């Protein structure tokens, strides 16, 4: 439920491993500026909602092993964090893609921005003029 962790301002460790959480929402976890680490392993988190990462300024540790990560643009807030917060090689070998067939167990740390240049870029001002005037 949203706002459940809202009165818990002084959190440092919040563990949610081995659960059946389909989706984690930024409104559910709320504002946790003092939070330093999170554990979401062995869960069914397909993707993280945009803006979830923005409410955790001091977050430095993240565990994402054993999750059905669908490696598309939906994990753009996630991978950018992993670039700035490099996981250990043992952990990096366990955080993998899951989306099936052609894509499989590809490491998330190996995906760079250029490999997803087709993803939705933020609205510019030149393109904003062109789409109106075309």
């Amino acid at each position: 439920a949203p706002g459940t962790f809202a009165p818990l301002r002084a959190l440092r460790n919040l563990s949610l491993a081995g659960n059946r959480l389909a989706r984690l929402e930024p409104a559910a976890l709320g504002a946790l500026p003092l939070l330093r680490s999170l554990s979401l392993q062995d869960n069914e988190l397909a993707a993280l909602a945009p803006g979830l990462l923005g409410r955790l300024p001091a977050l430095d540790a993240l565990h994402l092993r054993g999750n059905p990560w669908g490696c598309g643009c939906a994990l753009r807030p996630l991978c950018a964090w992993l670039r700035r917060h490099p996981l250990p090689a043992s952990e990096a070998e366990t955080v993998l893609c899951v989306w099936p067939g052609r894509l499989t167990l590809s490491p998330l740390t190996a995906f760079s921005d250029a490999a997803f240049s087709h993803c939705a870029q933020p609205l510019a001002l030149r393109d904003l003029a062109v789409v109106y005037t075309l």
Binding site: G18, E44, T94, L96, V98, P100, L105
Partner: protein
């Protein structure tokens, strides 16, 4: 040694046993040096895709009496050296 799970029991030669430990999921930190893995009599109801990643050189996998009812298509990716599978005594209704 780092190649052995913290909760499981390992012997030289790559043999690891994790049974009778009430594991709710696959133990983390699999290594390439383990050749035979035991996981029976646990409570691993759901098997995440790529759960057995890292132990690509494993040869025998046991999952008997572990409450299995749904297995992902890519859960066994990269287990090309795996030879023995014991999925019996579970509740798998469809593959």
């Amino acid at each position: 040694a780092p190649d052995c799970p913290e909760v499981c029991t390992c012997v030289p030669g790559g043999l690891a046993s994790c049974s009778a430990l009430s594991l709710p999921a696959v133990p983390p930190g699999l290594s390439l040096r383990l050749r035979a893995l035991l996981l029976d009599h646990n409570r691993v109801r759901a098997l995440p895709p790529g759960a057995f990643a890292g132990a690509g050189a494993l040869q025998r996998l046991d999952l008997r009496e572990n409450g299995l009812h749904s297995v992902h298509v890519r859960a066994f990716w990269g287990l090309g050296a795996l030879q023995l599978l014991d999925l019996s005594a579970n509740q798998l209704e469809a593959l």
